[PDB]
Ligand binder design. Structure first.
Ligand SMILES: NC(=O)CC[C@H](N)C(=O)O
Length: 225
């Protein structure tokens, strides 16, 4: 059976991928991508915004049909979900106060307080470098960034376009990006393991979108030429 409604697990605090406009509506690159894929499949989207660490459980337990949530494809995750072909390539970045000149890389988080999203690749990357780093873990990244603003952490680590977005969205916070890398986090759309019928349709849609202009129009909307 082809579901007429695809329940899409997504972010709500992960600009420019999944966040809320000024009327509380979900927007972002992943929101636009989901709608485009749904249109090619002939179905409607129902978004389920949720904290990231609950996304794999949601998909495995049948709360959602698909994940478009800035989710990096990893070999370990492929034991938990099936992924589409990659739809985006991200990197990493660290956000610090403008005043700070001690932190230029993950190496420099030595004996510092650092915030990360629970369940993220960022959390894995920082766990590795931590040399006595004090890691604080958050249910969503807006909470992490809250603690940076208040001085509860000295840095927050996330995907590079989200770090940039937080900086652009918060001039009054007097923050800046350091340690930026540009690749190494391929994003994929995930479906339940063994849902080959839906995965094939999603792959085909993505391939068509990259051919026909649809993908490149979404990319330009969010990132420019
Ligand atoms: N929504 C997120 O926080 C995802 C971050 C990272 N790309 C990952 O897959 O862990």
């Amino acid at each position: 059976h082809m579901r007429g409604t695809l329940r899409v697990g997504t972010e709500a605090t992960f600009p420019p991928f999944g966040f809320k406009d000024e009327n509380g509506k979900l927007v972002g690159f992943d929101i636009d991508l989901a709608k485009a894929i749904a249109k090619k499949l002939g179905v409607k989207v129902e978004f389920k915004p949720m904290d990231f660490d609950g996304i794999i459980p949601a998909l495995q337990s049948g709360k959602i049909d698909v994940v478009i949530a800035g989710m990096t494809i990893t070999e370990e995750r492929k034991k938990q979900v099936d992924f589409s072909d990659p739809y985006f390539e991200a990197g990493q970045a660290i956000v610090v106060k403008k005043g700070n000149d001690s932190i230029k890389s993950l190496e420099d988080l030595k004996g510092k307080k650092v915030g990360v999203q629970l369940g993220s690749t960022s959390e894995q990357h920082v766990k590795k470098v931590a040399a006595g780093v004090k890691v604080k873990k958050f249910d969503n990244f807006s909470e992490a960034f809250q603690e940076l603003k208040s001085g509860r952490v000295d840095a927050v680590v996330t995907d590079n376009a989200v770090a940039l977005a937080y900086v652009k969205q918060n001039p009054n916070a007097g923050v800046k990006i350091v340690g930026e890398t540009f690749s190494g986090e391929p994003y994929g759309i995930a479906v339940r393991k063994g849902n080959s019928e839906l995965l094939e349709k999603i792959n085909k849609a993505l391939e068509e979108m990259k051919k026909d202009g649809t993908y490149d129009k979404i990319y330009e909307k969010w990132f420019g030429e």
